[PDB]
Design a protein around this nucleic acid. Structure first.
Ligand code: DCP
Ligand code: CL
Ligand code: CL
Ligand code: CL
Ligand code: MG
Ligand code: MG
Ligand code: MG
Ligand code: NA
Ligand code: NA
Ligand code: NA
Length: 326
DNA sequence: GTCGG
DNA sequence: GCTGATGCGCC
DNA sequence: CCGACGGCGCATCAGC
């Protein structure tokens, strides 16, 4: 793609800052620069040209100058040749191992998948699951399979109570031809900002999905969020489907539009949308859009009747989910 | 790492 | 148990 | 050691 060299470089640096340096703001700066550069509709011919974009400063402009001149960056060469860095970065790819645990493990000489397997007693349940399905979770899900999964989920939710409404969000709702995982937004009339009437509204759905063997394991679970694992059933003498990650989020029904905006993403579109909201004097989360009063504190939630209404408050032209991907 | 108070 | 900080994760 | 930077759910740890 156009300017793919540059956005790959900046992404790789981003992941280094997050996973090795533990520098989440440098991670976020590298993410933002890559984002702006990717939507820039010309070939970047210099770092100066790039510097003009919001989120590109001197140091990134200089890196872009090097890469444009040489087709590589020495900094990233050194990082790739550092075995310790590589090991730490690699371990964070296990679901449940973040930058902190990855550094702890590598400090104790645990550097490979083999090592994690030999030292399974050192892992929490989440991590054990991340490891068990490490290969599967590296793979994307074709949209064809996402359709089957949607259909299993909607049907089983329908069977618990026909008043539930389940919406597959994330990259799927953005129309992607493959997805990293399944993200499901769930609402029920009994759960609103004003009132929780039923207990166990999420629980009911999860247990039903476990009962039909769709959901296979649980990473974490509370009253409104479920993180876990699921699997399509497969046909005889045909290899199984990979196990997949699934996220379910129960949102107050009167807050559907804020929730579906959050859960549709992308992640960087969300952060950028929320960033623009702050400079417009608003704050947005998955529940509400609120005005910022001086003293910092946010005021009452503003009424919202559509996804677009949230765009309106901050004066962004509406973006279809298609055009919310990076 | 970048931008803005 | 609490409050608050950290570590994991989600978009 | 200019500080903010998007915002939060679930699990767990420190200091009560
Ligand atoms: N864009 C910047 C740059 C620096 N600082 C901070 C860092 C210091 O804690 C404080 C005062 O730094 P200086 O004395 O360097 O700023 P001066 O304006 O006094 O420098 P000069 O003597 O160049 O005019 O401001 C800031 O708030 N915003
Ligand atoms: Cl940082
Ligand atoms: Cl809403
Ligand atoms: Cl809120
Ligand atoms: Mg997803
Ligand atoms: Mg997800
Ligand atoms: Mg994601
Ligand atoms: Na810039
Ligand atoms: Na991880
Ligand atoms: Na509108």
């Amino acid at each position: 793609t156009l300017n793919g060299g540059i956005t790959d470089m900046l992404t790789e640096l981003a992941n280094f800052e997050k996973n090795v340096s533990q520098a989440i703001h440098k991670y976020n700066a590298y993410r933002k620069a890559a984002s702006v550069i990717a939507k820039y509709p010309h070939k970047i011919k210099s770092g100066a040209e790039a510097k003009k974009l919001p989120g590109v400063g001197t140091k990134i402009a200089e890196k872009i100058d090097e890469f444009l001149a040489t087709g590589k960056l020495r900094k990233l060469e050194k990082i790739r040749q550092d075995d310790t860095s590589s090991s730490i970065n690699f371990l964070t790819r296990v679901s449940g191992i973040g930058p902190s645990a990855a550094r702890k493990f590598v400090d104790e000489g645990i550097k490979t998948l083999e090592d994690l397997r030999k030292n399974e007693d050192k892992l929490n349940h989440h991590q054990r699951i991340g490891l068990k399905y490490f290969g599967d979770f590296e793979k994307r899900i074709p949209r064809e399979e996402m359709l089957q999964m949607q259909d299993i989920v909607l049907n089983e939710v329908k069977k618990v109570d026909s008043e539930y409404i389940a919406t597959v969000c994330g990259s799927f709702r953005r129309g992607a031809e493959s997805s990293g995982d399944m993200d499901v937004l769930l609402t029920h009339p009994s759960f609103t900002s004003e009132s929780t009437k039923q207990p166990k509204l999420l629980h009911q759905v999860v247990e039903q999905l476990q009962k039909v063997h769709f959901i296979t394991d649980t990473l974490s679970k509370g009253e409104t969020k479920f993180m876990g694992v699921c699997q399509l059933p497969s046909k005889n003498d045909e290899k199984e489907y990979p196990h997949r990650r699934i996220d379910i989020r129960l949102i107050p029904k009167d807050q559907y539009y804020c929730g579906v905006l959050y859960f549709t993403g992308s992640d960087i579109f969300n952060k950028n949308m929320r960033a623009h909201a702050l400079e417009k004097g608003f704050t947005i989360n998955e529940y509400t859009i609120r005005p910022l009063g001086v003293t910092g504190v946010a005021g009452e939630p503003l009424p919202v009747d559509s996804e677009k209404d949230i765009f309106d408050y901050i004066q962004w032209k509406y973006r279809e989910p298609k055009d919310r991907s990076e």
